[PDB]
Write a protein that binds this ligand. Structure first.
Ligand SMILES: CCCCCCCC/C=C/CCCCCCCC(=O)O[C@@H](COC(=O)CCCCCCCCCCCCCCC)COP(=O)([O-])OCC[N+](C)(C)C
Ligand SMILES: CCCCCCCC/C=C/CCCCCCCC(=O)O[C@@H](COC(=O)CCCCCCCCCCCCCCC)COP(=O)([O-])OCC[N+](C)(C)C
Ligand SMILES: CCCCCCCC/C=C/CCCCCCCC(=O)O[C@@H](COC(=O)CCCCCCCCCCCCCCC)COP(=O)([O-])OCC[N+](C)(C)C
Ligand SMILES: CCCCCCCC/C=C/CCCCCCCC(=O)O[C@@H](COC(=O)CCCCCCCCCCCCCCC)COP(=O)([O-])OCC[N+](C)(C)C
Ligand SMILES: CCCCCCCC/C=C/CCCCCCCC(=O)O[C@@H](COC(=O)CCCCCCCCCCCCCCC)COP(=O)([O-])OCC[N+](C)(C)C
Ligand SMILES: CCCCCCCC/C=C/CCCCCCCC(=O)O[C@@H](COC(=O)CCCCCCCCCCCCCCC)COP(=O)([O-])OCC[N+](C)(C)C
Ligand SMILES: CCCCCCCC/C=C\CCCCCCCC(=O)O[C@@H](COC(=O)CCCCCCCCCCCCCCC)COP(=O)([O-])OCC[N+](C)(C)C
Ligand SMILES: CCCCCCCC/C=C\CCCCCCCC(=O)O[C@@H](COC(=O)CCCCCCCCCCCCCCC)COP(=O)([O-])OCC[N+](C)(C)C
Ligand SMILES: C[C@@H]1CC[C@@]2(OC1)O[C@H]1C[C@H]3[C@@H]4CC=C5C[C@@H](OCCC(CO)CO)CC[C@]5(C)[C@H]4CC[C@]3(C)[C@H]1[C@@H]2C
Ligand SMILES: C[C@@H]1CC[C@@]2(OC1)O[C@H]1C[C@H]3[C@@H]4CC=C5C[C@@H](OCCC(CO)CO)CC[C@]5(C)[C@H]4CC[C@]3(C)[C@H]1[C@@H]2C
Ligand SMILES: [Ca+2]
Lengths: 92, 92
């Protein structure tokens, strides 16, 4: 689950925040929103940052249209496959 | 699951946005919110667009009272039946 989390967190941050210098905030940002997604928080108005109803309009930029596709795959794998594998283990 | 998604996405967009010219945004709009519903985002303040607490007051129009009924059926089929069928397959 942690590897799946980082496989999404790292590209999301890199695509959406391409002007960053090194900081320990990078560590937080690559884990934080992806973890809360496990529990069904999709951050609906942050998904497409170039939409009119976006709460992150300044983040709109080149390549940012990729991250909804990434998040679509992430939740399918994380929220549906991996959480229910863990639940299947707990059921045994 | 994809057919169920489009069976809801297409009427929702058509009823709520009846003045559209052809664009590739139509493709996004018929899939986007219906996909995030799979994961429990109901878009609560967008459901009834003619309500006082609606975040889409300009969308209020003829026939827009239909879309809460459509979304009620969609989530029951998608969120409850189809996701748990997929989970049942994963459990096997
Ligand atoms: C540096 C960061 C990466 C590593 C993660 C460190 C954190 C902790 C997690 C650790 C997870 C790995 C645990 C196994 C390795 C420890 C020893 C072990 O048991 O080895 C086994 C092989 O080991 C492998 O095959 C491991 C291969 C490396 C995996 C690296 C990615 C994992 C993290 C993914 C990224 C997300 C999570 C992390 C967040 C980034 C062999 O063991 P054994 O003793 O021969 O067998 C025991 C049974 N016996 C008694 C019968 C013999
Ligand atoms: C998992 C993948 C990510 C990368 C992995 C590598 C690890 C990365 C490690 C990073 C920690 C090392 C860098 C410390 C820098 C802290 C500076 C700072 O602003 O601190 C902030 C918080 O933090 C603290 O106050 C102290 C640090 C606590 C959090 C880290 C615990 C370790 C993670 C546990 C697991 C072990 C980790 C090991 C690996 C799993 C203080 O600022 P603020 O809270 O924003 O605001 C407070 C109020 N203020 C605004 C007035 C200030
Ligand atoms: C997959 C990884 C798991 C590995 C093990 C555990 C790893 C633990 C976590 C590692 C990530 C980094 C830890 C924090 C330190 C870096 C941030 C920092 O220094 O400061 C930041 C604050 O930081 C906080 O306030 C701390 C909150 C951290 C997230 C904890 C919840 C998510 C848990 C996820 C668990 C995933 C478990 C996965 C299982 C499925 C920012 O402060 P600053 O730097 O001053 O910046 C200025 C900010 N300011 C101006 C707004 C004030
Ligand atoms: C059933 C369907 C799946 C079929 C296969 C996969 C199909 C993949 C999906 C296809 C839908 C359409 C793809 C995008 C291209 C059209 C939109 C476009 O051109 O621009 C739009 C942006 O578009 C984006 O920012 C891209 C985000 C698309 C949504 C991805 C997540 C949903 C995943 C769903 C996955 C469902 C999986 C179902 C499984 C249950 C709008 O930009 P514009 O046109 O310039 O308009 C101006 C807007 N502006 C002024 C605000 C800037
Ligand atoms: C153009 C868009 C619609 C099509 C979708 C294309 C996308 C991809 C999805 C494709 C899903 C369909 C896969 C099956 C068809 C491929 C070949 C096949 O296996 O045929 C089978 C019959 O095939 C049918 O009965 C298909 C009937 C058409 C379904 C059209 C709607 C599906 C998409 C709904 C809309 C939502 C999803 C899409 C997003 C809009 C017979 O196969 P066979 O080889 O005889 O049997 C193999 C076993 N053997 C080796 C023992 C013999
Ligand atoms: C699934 C059911 C729906 C219909 C399906 C039919 C296919 C529909 C296909 C549509 C794509 C083909 C037409 C191109 C339109 C792009 C114009 C545009 O606005 O681009 C936008 C994004 O998009 C891009 O930048 C390029 C397109 C990438 C996303 C779509 C990939 C295909 C979906 C994958 C799966 C295969 C699909 C095949 C079938 C499954 C750029 O604009 P923005 O992001 O809004 O804003 C960014 C900032 N700006 C404002 C400064 C610009
Ligand atoms: C094995 C297959 C290999 C792939 C082959 C296909 C290759 C790709 C084919 C089609 C993708 C669509 C074309 C790209 C988008 C066009 C728009 C553009 O040029 O500018 C975009 C960025 O600038 C770029 O140059 C983006 C280039 C994308 C990199 C390649 C993506 C690969 C996708 C992975 C492949 C997965 C395939 C599907 C798997 C399920 C947007 O710019 P803007 O937003 O307008 O700028 C903001 C302006 N502002 C700052 C003022 C706000
Ligand atoms: C096979 C079974 C047979 C079906 C029999 C039942 C048939 C239905 C019987 C009754 C439905 C209720 C009556 C219609 C709505 C009343 C309001 C009205 O007249 O105006 C409406 C539009 O104008 C219309 O003419 C809407 C007509 C709806 C099409 C028919 C619906 C079929 C439902 C499917 C049947 C499923 C049955 C249940 C299944 C579980 C609203 O106008 P407004 O919003 O005031 O305008 C906005 C003004 N503004 C722009 C300034 C903001
Ligand atoms: C198997 C996994 C692959 C992914 C991964 O784990 C293992 O690989 C690790 C590499 C880490 C970075 C290494 C170096 C730094 C520089 C530091 O800079 C000082 C601070 C500054 C403040 O201003 C001084 O002034 C900031 C932190 C950063 C960017 C790390 C972040 C976490 C990263 C990306 C980790 C990530 C989760
Ligand atoms: C089995 C499934 C039934 C549903 C469905 O899949 C198969 O059937 C497909 C038909 C598609 C549309 C066909 C033609 C166009 C015109 C184009 O116009 C140029 C743009 C303009 C920009 O300004 C040029 O300048 C825009 C796209 C649009 C409306 C398609 C959208 C997706 C649709 C609705 C698809 C939908 C998901
Ligand atoms: Ca939920």
């Amino acid at each position: 689950m942690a590897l799946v989390l980082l496989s999404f967190g790292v590209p999301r941050k890199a695509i959406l925040y391409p002007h960053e210098e090194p900081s320990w905030s990078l560590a937080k940002d690559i884990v934080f929103h992806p973890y809360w997604m496990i529990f069904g928080e999709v951050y609906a108005y942050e998904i497409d940052v170039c939409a009119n109803d976006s709460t992150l309009p300044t983040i709109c930029g080149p390549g940012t249209w990729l991250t909804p596709f990434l998040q679509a795959v992430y939740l399918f794998v994380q929220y549906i496959i991996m959480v229910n594998l863990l639940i299947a283990f707990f059921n045994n």
